[PDB]
């Protein structure tokens, strides 16, 4: 229990001790629950998600960093590896391939990389995945951009 708090303190320290340009990631530790975090991530440039801001909800288990956090999109997103109705993410580092080497910040970065480089296999949105697998990249970008403009630009 106290090991998790020490680790989460290093990460809260590092997200405060930085004013780096291009804050593509902004982790917001929570007021009263050290184990609840929210993140703001910028859509990766040169992707249909560019210009959007997506909110991620982190639910940190008490054995963290020995156990992965529970992460999901609160912003709607059209992506092969995100369940549109629930925001659940299919990413192996959040499940089987987790390691204490990962951090909340690097998890956000893996999600951004996933947004820029989808995996039409392992699909939680088969319509989004079908567009990519069938070679309809214009269609994928068109619908992903629409949802970015309608749901991820406040």
């Amino acid at each position: 229990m106290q090991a998790s708090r020490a680790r989460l303190f290093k990460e809260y320290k590092e997200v405060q001790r930085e004013k780096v340009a291009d804050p593509d990631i902004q982790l917001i530790c929570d007021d009263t629950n050290i184990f609840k975090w929210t993140a703001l991530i910028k859509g990766p440039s040169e992707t249909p998600y560019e210009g959007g801001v997506f909110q991620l909800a982190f639910s940190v288990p008490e054995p963290y960093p020995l156990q992965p956090p529970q992460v999901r999109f609160l912003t709607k997103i059209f992506h092969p590896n995100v369940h549109f109705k629930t925001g659940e993410i299919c990413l192996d580092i959040l499940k089987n391939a987790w390691s204490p080497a990962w951090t909340l910040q690097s998890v956000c970065r893996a999600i951004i990389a996933l947004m820029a480089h989808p995996e039409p296999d392992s699909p939680l949105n088969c319509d989004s995945g079908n567009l990519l697998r069938s070679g309809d990249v214009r269609g994928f970008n068109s619908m992903a951009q629409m949802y970015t403009r309608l749901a991820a630009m406040p």
């Binding site: 319509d127 989004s128 567009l131 309809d136 214009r138 269609g139 403009r149």
Partner: protein
Amino acid sequence: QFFQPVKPTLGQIVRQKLSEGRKVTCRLLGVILEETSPEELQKQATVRSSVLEVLLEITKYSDLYLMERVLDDESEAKVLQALENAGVFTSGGLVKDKVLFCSTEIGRTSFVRQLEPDWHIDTNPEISTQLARFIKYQLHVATVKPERTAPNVFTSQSIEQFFGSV
């Protein structure tokens, strides 16, 4: 008399045929635009003047998504400028963000299944047949009725004829 006749407006006719279907997807070529192939969209795009009144009544009542297969980026711009030339975008109706573009015919089926409209309007029979399993109502626009349409796939010669009359 003053008490025993009647006459409905175009909006009431359109809304009646929509049958409370307040979410609609619809292709562009042929049914809304005069052009009939993506190759033509590389040269010009033109909204059918006969579809305009009914189209606007649909946008006031229903969330509408237009979609079409195109061959390049310049075709997209030509389409958007055509829709704007005809005043298809209005406050309270259709917005430019809800006009979608793809590179394959079957890509439209992915748009529609994601959007889950009450109505889809198309001209490709394989698309209408494939979507009848998922979409409550469809209008298949064709010169002649397919020999076989699903019971929930209705056929007509134009959007304005099907929704614009009784």
